[PDB]
Every structure is written in C-alpha cells, then in structure tokens.
C-alpha cells in the first residue's frame with residue numbers, strides 16, 4: 001500500500017504467532033519491540049536512542065509478517081516506548097520513501 | 100524521488116540560512132535538529148524516545164527546504180545525536196511509505 005504520514009504509520013504485525021501494533025520507522029536501523037516472550041536463543045545487546053541506551057534481547061532470523069508481507073530478520077526486544085519496525089525489516093518488505 | 104532504505108535516508112536540508120544533513124524519519128512525530136542558535140522566541144519542551152527524554156527548544160513556523168521541497172512548521176532544537184525530519188514536515192513535502 002501507500003501510507004501517508006498525517007498520522008503515525010502504525011500497522012499490525014504477526015510475530016511468534018501473536019498480533020501486535022508497530023510503527024514503520026525509517027529512522028531506526030533495527031527493529032525493537034516491547035517486552036515479550038519469543039522462543040529460541042537470544043543474546044544481550046545494547047542500543048542507543050535519542051535519550052540514551054537500553055538493554056535488549058537480540059533474536060536473530062525471526063519470522064515476522066508486517067502488514068501482510070513476510071520478513072525474517074533480527075528482532076530486538078526490550079524497554080522501548082513503542083514497537084518500531086526498522087530498516088533491517090522495512091527493506092525486506094520492499095518499503096521505500098517517495099515524494 | 101524514491102529513497103530506498105538500504106542505508107539511512109539522509110538528505111540535505113536548508114534551515115535558518117544554513118545547509119545540514121538530516122534523516123527522513125517516519126517514526127518521529129516532530130522535527131528535531133542539532134543545537135543551532137536560531138532567532139526568535141521559543142518554548143521549553145521534553146521529548147522522549149529509546150533511552151529516555153531530552154530537553155529541547157521548540158521554535159514554531161520555521162521554514163525548512165528538504166530536497167528542494169519547502170516546508171514550514173515546528174522545529175525542536177537541542178542536544179540530539181542526529182538531525183531528524185519528522186512527520187510534521189514530511190507530510191508537507193508529500194512523503195509517503197510504499198511497499
């Protein structure tokens with residue numbers, strides 16, 4: 001689809017078999033989701049945002065469906081204020097900016 | 100134009116008579132720029148993201164030229180680690196997400 005930006009670009013995602021709402025975020029290199037349970041191994045990582053760094057759980061090669069489009073990539077889970085879909089996955093679904 | 104998301108969506112902007120590089124950020128409600136001594140009145144504001152909040156100065160009705168496209172709106176100035184063009188201005192240049 002074509003998504004305008006008058007409102008936050010929020011979409012439904014499916015991860016680990018569960019539905020959630022997430023923000024398409026071209027300013028995020030990586031995808032960061034609020035605290036949740038995901039199966040499989042994970043390793044600790046640090047990521048920095050506008051206000052500092054947070055500790056996240058890095059899950060690699062995770063299946064995630066974004067607005068009906070499949071992706072398999074890295075998903076960071078931690079105390080983010082909002083579920084954000086970053087460029088690592090936006091590229092997989094063929095997302096571009098246009099004006 | 101069309102901007103793929105393999106790399107950070109960095110573009111040149113013109114603000115207050117100065118040229119800068121900034122990130123086209125669909126995840127930012129409002130525009131946040133690196134410290135710059137702009138003229139005119141302003142109001143204190145706190146904005147939050149990953150890592151917490153930072154203190155910024157809110158200037159209203161500021162003109163920015165983004166890839167030759169003009170836009171006028173609120174600009175937040177403070178110790179941001181990156182120049183971010185938010186939805187308040189991206190809407191004015193006709194920017195959409197497409198996949």
Ligand SMILES: CCOP(=O)(COc1ccc(C[C@H](NC(=O)O[C@H]2CO[C@H]3OCC[C@H]32)[C@H](O)CN(C[C@@H](C)CC)S(=O)(=O)c2ccc(CO)cc2)cc1)OCC
Pocket residue numbers: 023025026027028029030031032047048049050051052053081082084086124125126127128129130131146147148149150180181183185
């Ligand atoms: C030298 C480099 O500095 P740095 O590493 C951090 O640099 C960056 C800092 C921020 C960004 C942009 C933000 N992206 C981000 O958080 O991405 C994280 C995850 O993916 C990684 O990739 C890049 C960083 C990591 C996001 O797009 C927009 N935000 C809101 C969303 C979170 C929705 C709540 S918001 O900025 O907070 C914000 C809040 C309120 C307003 C007013 O309306 C305007 C902007 C990009 C790079 O310093 C370490 C301390």
